């Protein structure tokens, strides 16, 4: 339409505002829906339209509210339970890490890649502080797929001379999209299109010992010796799936045992979501190579992470340069990561997860046995938690539902069936009991709902006996779950 | 030892600091060298050492001078043609790109991943905008190396439907470190350790265009049908190596002959730096791929694009999440591009960029022929350039020698004998003449040095007429010629 | 009797046979051979020609090169690489780009003379 330097312009001009008027309002959403549309993705659009209703599948972001809350251009609030699937863990704009940014940004943005920066020293010598055991050395980069991407590729460094090259994943894990990542990534849609990929990875079931005691007795069998098993601690996108008490120590006892590498994707579980600071800390398991990023980045910057033993990381010592990444480590992410790791001990936010996240599952439990007819069952562990319900629709409706009553929720890319609640770790008492009961009320509605449409699909009753049901289900919408026994009650006498 | 809290506490006390006392100054080197020995990688200050003399291999770097120039934590400045291998096309710490990083910080930096964030729209536009013809859906990451990965992705989900699965690239050709862009990257020290790589990924001769046909017709003819032909226009890694006129477009014709789609990868040669916004503009030709990162984040953010035709593009358009990755396309970093493309577009400093580069070429070029003993040729097209010597340890001594005049050169992955001139297109011409003189005075301590080490070795010589012969070569270095022939000329008579 | 007497009728020094049912067998002999030589010594990838057959199991089809032969059975071995028959740059240049990127030639397979690409005779030399 216009040239790139008009564009240019106009969108710094909406940089630069801070609020807008309505008719600036409709004509930014409209602008963003038509560009969607034809620069970045339609089925976007189609996807959101099946988690809402009406006009809000055209919610545009503007500003964070509070450290919890994100404000659409229309100025709605909504309450932030999403967290970007584990990215903001400290809350949104953390008073701490913008601050540390914006210094950073005073001194300089990007490093030169040729002298030492010294926020990449100080950010190593952080996490080698941090993790556990004899995890020591550090290496940067900018997303979580990068951190999985150079595990593998320490693992292969470590293990080709030694004549291992097979990787052992789980089903229903996710490590990234990157061919690489992708590679043990377990979801058939988001592999089979990109066949062939890397050779010589292999899937047991996640949580089960026994079957992966077999994949590596079986691979020493044949020659194909294991390289590295890769495994998250707790299954984010395959729904919230958590391994049965010691399923990581007995992997790294495994691993021991057979001469492999334990590489833990902590990518979604770091950072204190799951009432510890990592996930492996329930265990105290160390792993020999261990990947982070998301929340690393304290909701203001993207990084990756990827810390490994010195025995395993040392095959980068006589060329430094095997491996590396264009952005990795530069001086705004690791102020930010900093910051982050400052902010989480100094307000203990991982305990505070454990707590909150207790509460928030309870809830959810009660609200579970009250609506069996909608929930199959709630998971969690500190502030990482997942509903599963007994449909897709279903859970699509409750994800609509509570984008309705402004708490935003999302699906996870493994599991259809089940819905993530991952609030910030800062996440208020007081929005605690304020998502518990829009979970409440979104479960009312979901049952008059099906009620709905369950008593339009008896087949026993006459044409205009429905009506009376209808009707009395509308205007007096009160006999419910007890109106379609009701239903059912002259359906199975009439049958 | 110390807690994390500690670390993070004084690195943060660190970040807030504007300048160091000397005390501090040397308080902190040493803890980033000592960091960087058990944290990072050692291997780092042993290849510093290969390109400094002392203490030069410990330079720590602290913020950005002028737009052109970097200060270490000793108050020394450097004039920067490095420029991150390509990242600071505008310079450091631009003002247009910090003040629009600046309010989107106010506003959020990162976006909640589910509703629509309008920046990704507006630089989807822009970028439709500014690429050459049906070039007209984005795609964001965080790297260059993610965006070689999302157009190995879309070429595979496109091909594979119709029978073909192999790739060609260029030997020489540099795409990225992450396993599925190094299949495609084509360093034999850079792959071979982490074999077995993606199947199907066979490279020939950059710049022959018979060489390609063959590898297309054979492949053809074997049913190894090629799906996607990538290189760069530019090869920079591989020492600034420049196709035949007409090689591109050749390229493009062979791509629509076959049926494969062509990517190129601009992460080092887009943004302007070879005189126009992008080097496939020099010909006229559009790619079904492009590929773009480093300088598209100003030198403030991390980004990666990969812009498609609809056509190709199309293919993620029934699952919008067969592709996507944690960070891409945030607000920051959307709003570091828009300003940068504003900022090359209201300066046009593609043009400055020819010009700028025309000049210092021809600058390189006569030095060149005044020094034919150490350097081998001089190439580069607009302000990417490169200086290629007789050995390796002719180009060492010339990057420590520039960097003891503190101008900031580096080599270049691929090329071992070749020195990088990678400076920010923002180079003043005061800064220009003062590049050429720091290059002539680095020309001639090489070849005094030389003499030296000649003078220094001849073992006819006994101890008094050597420290005459060096004691003369320091007094009156211009006689230098002479001497080491008048030493040779005695080394012979008594042999 | 008749190892030695192969040895005796073979140019230089081919000095050990072994002994299969086919020509396909042969040729996966050959494989092995090359693989176990060359395995430890760093070197993978295989270069054949277009037009060549040297059988249709799986291991010598990846040598074999007629499109229709191979497709139904794909993927077949992996590192296997074709170049025109008696274009002797042509296999310079897969031999030199091979070792440029790491992917360095184990082996190289050929008919003297392609006899089901038509009777195809190479250039003298």
């Given at each position: 339409?216009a040239?790139?330097?008009?564009?240019?312009?106009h969108?710094?001009?909406?940089?630069?505002?801070?609020?807008?008027?309505?008719?600036?309002?409709?004509?930014?959403?409209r602008?963003?829906?038509?560009?969607?549309?034809?620069?970045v993705?339609?089925?976007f659009?189609?996807?959101?339209?099946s988690?809402?209703a009406?006009?809000?599948?055209?919610?545009?972001?503007?500003?964070?509210?509070?450290?919890?809350?994100?404000?659409?251009?229309?100025?709605?609030?909504?309450?932030?339970?999403?967290?970007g699937?584990?990215?903001?863990?400290?809350?949104?704009r953390?008073?701490?890490?913008?601050?540390?940014?914006?210094?950073?940004?005073?001194?300089?943005?990007?490093?030169?890649?040729?002298?030492?920066?010294?926020?990449?020293?100080?950010?190593?010598?952080?996490?080698?502080?941090?993790?556990?055991?004899?995890?020591?050395?550090?290496?940067?980069?900018?997303s979580?797929?990068?951190?999985?991407?150079?595990a593998?590729?320490?693992?292969?460094?470590?293990q080709?001379?030694?004549?291992?090259f097979?990787?052992?994943?789980?089903?229903?894990?996710?490590?990234?999209?990157?061919?690489?990542?992708?590679?043990?990534?377990?979801?058939?849609?988001?592999?089979?299109?990109?066949?062939?990929?890397?050779?010589?990875?292999?899937h047991?079931?996640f949580?089960?010992?026994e079957?992966?005691?077999?994949?590596?007795?079986?691979?020493?069998?044949?020659?194909?010796?294991?390289a590295?098993?890769?495994?998250?601690?707790?299954?984010?996108?395959?729904?919230?799936?958590?391994?049965?008490?010691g399923?990581?120590?007995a992997?790294?006892?495994?691993?021991?045992?057979?001469?492999?590498?334990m590489?833990?994707?902590?990518?979604?579980?770091?950072?204190?979501?799951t009432?510890?600071?990592?996930?492996?800390?329930?265990?105290?398991?160390?792993?020999?190579?261990?990947?982070?990023?998301?929340?690393?980045?304290?909701?203001?910057?993207?990084?990756?992470?990827?810390?490994?033993?010195?025995?395993?990381?040392?095959?980068?010592?006589?060329?430094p340069?095997?491996h590396?990444?264009?952005?990795?480590?530069?001086?705004?992410?690791?102020?930010?990561?900093?910051?982050?790791?400052?902010?989480?001990?100094?307000?203990?936010?991982?305990?505070?997860?454990?707590?909150?996240?207790?509460?928030?599952?309870?809830?959810?439990?009660?609200?579970?046995?009250?609506?069996?007819?909608?929930?199959?069952?709630?998971?969690?562990?500190?502030?990482?938690?997942?509903?599963?319900f007994?449909?897709?629709?279903?859970?699509?409706?409750?994800?609509?539902?509570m984008?309705?009553?402004?708490?935003?929720?999302?699906?996870?890319?493994?599991?259809?069936?089940?819905?993530?609640?991952?609030?910030?770790?800062?996440?208020?008492?007081?929005?605690?009991?304020?998502?518990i009961?829009?979970?409440?009320?979104?479960?009312?509605?979901?049952?008059?709902?099906?009620?709905?449409y369950?008593?339009?699909?008896?087949?026993?009753?006459?044409?205009?006996?429905?009506?009376?049901?209808?009707?009395?289900?509308?205007?007096?919408?009160?006999?419910?779950?007890?109106?379609?026994a009701?239903?059912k009650?002259?359906?199975?006498?009439?049958?």
């Open positions: 339409s040239s790139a330097l008009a564009c240019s312009a969108a710094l001009n909406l940089i630069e505002k801070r609020t807008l008027d309505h008719e600036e309002m409709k004509a930014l959403n602008e963003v829906i038509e560009y969607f549309k034809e620069h993705n339609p089925g659009l189609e996807y959101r339209k988690v809402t009406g006009g809000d599948y055209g919610a545009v972001e503007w500003q964070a509210g509070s450290l919890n809350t994100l404000v659409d251009t229309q100025g709605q609030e909504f309450i932030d339970c999403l967290g699937f584990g990215i903001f863990n400290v809350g949104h953390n008073p701490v890490v913008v601050s540390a940014v914006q210094n950073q940004l005073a001194k300089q943005p990007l490093h030169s890649q040729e002298l030492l920066d010294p926020l990449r020293a100080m950010l190593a010598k952080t996490l080698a502080a941090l993790t556990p055991g004899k995890l020591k050395y550090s290496f940067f980069c900018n979580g797929t990068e951190s999985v991407e150079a593998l590729k320490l693992a292969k460094a470590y080709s001379p030694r004549g291992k097979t990787f052992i994943a789980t089903s229903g894990a996710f490590h990234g999209k990157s061919l690489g990542a992708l590679s043990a990534t377990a979801k058939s849609t988001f592999r089979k299109p990109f066949m062939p990929l890397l050779p010589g990875f292999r047991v079931p949580g089960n010992i079957a992966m005691r077999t994949a590596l007795n079986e691979c020493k069998k044949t020659g194909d010796d294991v590295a098993v890769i495994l998250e601690p707790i299954q984010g996108e395959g729904g919230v799936i958590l391994p049965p008490p399923y990581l120590t992997v790294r006892k495994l691993c021991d045992e057979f001469g492999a590498l590489i833990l994707d902590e990518v979604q579980t770091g950072m204190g979501r009432g510890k600071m990592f996930a492996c800390e329930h265990e105290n398991v160390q792993p020999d190579i261990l990947c982070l990023a998301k929340a690393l980045g304290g909701g203001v910057m993207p990084i990756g992470a990827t810390i490994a033993t010195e025995e395993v990381f040392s095959v980068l010592f006589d060329n340069f095997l590396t990444t264009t952005f990795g480590g530069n001086p705004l992410a690791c102020a930010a990561a900093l910051a982050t790791i400052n902010v989480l001990l100094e307000q203990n936010l991982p305990a505070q997860a454990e707590q909150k996240g207790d509460m928030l599952l309870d809830g959810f439990r009660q609200l579970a046995r009250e609506y069996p007819d909608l929930v199959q069952e709630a998971r969690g562990k500190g502030m990482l938690m997942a509903i599963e007994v449909d897709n629709e279903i859970g699509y409706n409750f994800a609509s539902e984008f309705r009553q402004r708490v935003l929720v999302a699906g996870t890319l493994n599991n259809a069936k089940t819905i993530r609640i991952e609030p910030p770790l800062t996440l208020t008492i007081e929005q605690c009991e304020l998502v009961k829009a979970a409440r009320k979104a479960l009312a509605a979901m049952r008059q709902q099906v009620a709905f369950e008593i339009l699909h008896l087949p026993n009753l006459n044409e205009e006996q429905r009506n009376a049901f209808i009707q009395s289900l509308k205007d007096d919408p009160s006999q419910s779950a007890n109106l379609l009701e239903a009650k002259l359906n199975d006498a009439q049958a």
